[PDB]
Structure formats: C-alpha cells, structure tokens
C-alpha cells in the first residue's frame, strides 16, 4: 500500500544512487593516493591535487563528446562516470587551501592560472580526441 508510482521512482533513484556511490568511492580513492604520495613534491604548486584535476578534466571532456553523440547506453553509467568518478577524482577545495597557504603572491596566482587553464585544456584534449577519432 505504498503507491506503485512512488515505489518505482524511489527504487530507480536508489539504483542511480548506488551508481554514484561506487563511481565516487573509486574516484576519491585515486585522488587520495595521488595527492598523499605526490603533494610532498612541490609546495608552491602541489601536483597531486593538480594531477587528479587534469585527469578528471580529460576524462569528463572525453565523455561530453561521447555521451552526447553516443547514446543507446544508460544514465546509470553516465552518472557514475561524470558526477561520481570525475567528481571524486576532482576537487576545487584542496586546490583552494594551498593558494591561501601561499597567500598567508607569485605562486598563489600561478596556482590559479595553471590549475584553471590546464584542467580546461584537458577537457579540450578529451573532446578533441573523442570527436576526431570517431568522426
């Protein structure tokens, strides 16, 4: 006596949640590793939290061109790969801490410029690659 429409809606959302849970619990793990093992190796521009940002930019930029011109699949996998994997692997916060850790000024602005423009050229790389290879 729980209303079939609502039962099915909430079950669907539970599967779509399980999706994001798994995608993100892998994406975060990868970033944790790269940061802890590769942030000790430059304080002015920490490359662990930059490697994961560049990598997530590349992946989700590969998949904007992919999951736009290639359907017949599922929002399940789209979601766990986009708002899960590339959200857990990526971060805006761990990059924000070190900028003010430099503020509190040349490398604090280098952090800004490098992070932004490079993780964007990673999206460019991804879109480029995917749309060109299978055009």
């Amino acid at each position, epitope marked *: *006596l*729980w*209303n*079939w*429409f609502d*039962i*099915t*809606n909430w*079950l*669907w959302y*539970i*599967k779509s949640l399980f999706a994001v849970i798994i995608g993100g619990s892998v994406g975060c793990t990868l970033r944790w590793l790269l940061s802890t093992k590769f942030n000790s190796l430059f304080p002015n521009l920490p490359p662990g939290t930059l490697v994961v940002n560049l990598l997530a930019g590349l992946i989700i930029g590969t998949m904007l061109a992919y999951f736009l011109r290639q359907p*017949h699949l599922d929002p399940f996998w789209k979601l766990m790969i986009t708002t899960g994997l590339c959200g857990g692997l990526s971060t805006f916060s761990t990059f924000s801490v070190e900028v003010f850790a430099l503020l509190q000024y040349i490398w604090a602005l280098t952090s800004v410029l490098v992070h932004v423009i490079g993780s964007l050229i990673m999206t460019a790389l991804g879109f480029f690659i995917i749309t060109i290879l299978f055009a």
Partner: antibody
Amino acid sequence: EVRLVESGGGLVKPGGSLRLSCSASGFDFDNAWMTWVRQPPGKGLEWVGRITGPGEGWSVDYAESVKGRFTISRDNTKNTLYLEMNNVRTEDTGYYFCARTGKYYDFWSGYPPGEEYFQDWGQGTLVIVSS
Amino acid sequence: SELTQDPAVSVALKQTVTITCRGDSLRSHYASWYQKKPGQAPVLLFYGKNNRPSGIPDRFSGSASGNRASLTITGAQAEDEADYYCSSRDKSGSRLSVFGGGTKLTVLS
C-alpha cells in the same frame, strides 16, 4: 478460481450512453489494478483505461481517444468494475475486455513507472454503435 | 501505434519464428506478449526481463534490445496459429499503456 465476466454490451445509436460491467472473482479484487481493452471488429487490441489500486488513491488513466467521454470506476464490495461510455462515436464499436493488471518493475533495468501487464482477461462484451 | 509490429508472418510446423515489436518506449520499458484467437480471450505469454507465467509452454520466450522486443516461438505448433500483441508504455515514463498492431501467425501445416 479467477473469473472475470463482462456484461451490458449491445446496440446504441451515436451520441448514446452505455454501462459495461465486469464481475470479478477468485482473487483479491479490492487491491488489483484493473484495465479495459477493446477490440474493434477486424482490428487489434486497444488499451482503453486503467484504474489504480488503494495505494494510489484510485487514480484512473485513459486512452487519448477516450479521455473525456469514458469513466472507469469500481465497487470493491460488489466486486465489479465499471466502464461508463457517454456521447458515443461509432469508433467505439468492438468487444470490451476487463483485465486484471499486474505491475512490474525490475530494479536493475527499470524506469518508472515500470510497465503494467494483463494476466487475466474476461471473454469480452460486444458494443455496436451505428445509426 | 507507437508500438510497431509486422502485420503478418508465418512459419512451417515444428520450426521457430520470432515476432518483433518496435518503438521508442521499448528502450526504457519492458513489454508483454499476448496470444489471441478469435472469440477467445487474450492470453498473457510473457513480460518483463524473463517472466513466463505458469502454464504457458516453455517454447514461448520474450527478448529485449535497443528499441526492439520480440516473442520467440520455438517448435511451431498448429495451436499457435493466432494473433500476437506486444504491450508496453506509449512513451517513456507514462502510466498509459498501449498495444502494438498485432501479428498474424500462420502455422504452414
């Protein structure tokens, strides 16, 4: 066991009115989703409408060609389903079947609101509509 | 008519035939397959992922892909010469259900 019998078809001139009835037995009537499905003579089956169950507030959904003219209802005490046909067009000719409507949703592949199926059918009841 | 079938299709006796339904909704929702002889009521034959209700012989089997659904009759019998209808949603996410055109099976016996 499970029995559904339709009743009340026959002749009716265009613009008239008619009440088709479905006496149901052999299962929990008071909770089962119910569906009408009619077959015009020499045509395929056409889903008419479906009234929900208790959990859904007795909502009813209608086929587009029928919406506004037909009204589905139920007496869970008398264990009968009702289709009230008002302002009739000759289109609505054909046999009329009440069907017990199972609900289905596989958790993994599903998408709301699942998809309903029709396990048990009546024999029909012939409504003819001509001047 | 959002669900589309080929109107008629035959098969020799003891052979195997498949009726195919097509439509947008079929990508996001499953189907149900109904047998229908004249005068006689429709017979549920299959639905969902892999549900064959009891009594329906093992030789009836449903299938689903991309935008297509299919009823598979393995080992044709003369008592299968009937009409066959797919049934699903009209559009993706609707409470309204809808049947296909139907497919006339001749069992060339």
